[PDB]
Amino acid sequence: SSKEPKFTKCRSPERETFSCHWTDEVNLGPIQLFYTRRNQEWKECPDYVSAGENSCYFNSSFTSIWIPYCIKLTSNGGTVDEKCFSVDEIVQPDPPIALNWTLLNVSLTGIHADIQVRWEAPRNAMVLEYELQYKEVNETKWKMMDPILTTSVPVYSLKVDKEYEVRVRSKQRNSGNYGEFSEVLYVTL
């Protein structure tokens, strides 16, 4: 038999490699992934271990030329899920790490302050631009800044009276999907 397993996500961290993920057949044991380089010949997943559980990992030989794939989940032998995609549609960079911040200036009234948030580009870096986000801790909407190329960015006019939250996500320059957010950095003036 099989059960009801389904694809969750396929992700490319740097547009060179990617892996696809799915759920458990509920565990049963006869699951497989097959892929094809067309819209033809179906070949089994080349690596069921590198990307972890219920995953298939495709090394950089799969992004030699513009790719155009299709994959299907298999339980015993019967399809249970399918998906087609190119590596471009799934690019999703890793977030920055080591978020820091220094005070830059205080307004004449001491009411406001300017800071500079800094971070390190994910260690696997396709040129990335970052989108910094912040908001009052006690608030619920996140203010967003334009994507920037530098691994730092000044944030102007924060109110001294408040405690802030900062988070930066990575994105491929141009049409690029965003990736996960970094570890939240707390800013108390």
Please check whether residue 41 is in contact with residue 14, taking contact to mean a CB–CB distance below 8 angstroms.
Answer: no
Instruction: State how far the Cα of 183 lies from the Cα of 140, in Å rounded to an integer.
Output: 18
Enumerate domains of the chain plus CATH numbers.
1-93 (2.60.40.10), 94-189 (2.60.40.10)
SS3 7: strand
Please check whether residue 154 is in contact with residue 134, taking contact to mean a CB–CB distance below 8 angstroms.
Answer: no
Instruction: State how far the Cα of 170 lies from the Cα of 148, in Å rounded to an integer.
Output: 10
Burial label, 181 (beta-carbon count in 10 A; 0-12, 13-18, 19+): middle
Cα distances (angstroms) measured from residue 29 to each of 44, 58, 69, 89? 16, 22, 25, 30
Method used to obtain the model: X-ray
Please check whether residue 80 is in contact with residue 2, taking contact to mean a CB–CB distance below 8 angstroms.
Answer: yes
Instruction: State how far the Cα of 85 lies from the Cα of 68, in Å rounded to an integer.
Output: 6
Give the contacts of 25 (CB within 8 A, at least 6 positions apart). Answer: 2, 3, 4, 5, 31, 75, 80
Residue with tokens 């911040």: 101
Q: Structure tokens of 144?
A: 């967003």
Q: Are strands 78-85 and 69-75 parallel, antiparallel or unpaired?
A: antiparallel
SS3 49: coil
Please check whether residue 164 is in contact with residue 187, taking contact to mean a CB–CB distance below 8 angstroms.
Answer: yes
Instruction: State how far the Cα of 116 lies from the Cα of 172, in Å rounded to an integer.
Output: 23
Instruction: Please give the resolution of this entry in Å, rounded to 1 decimal.
Output: 2.7
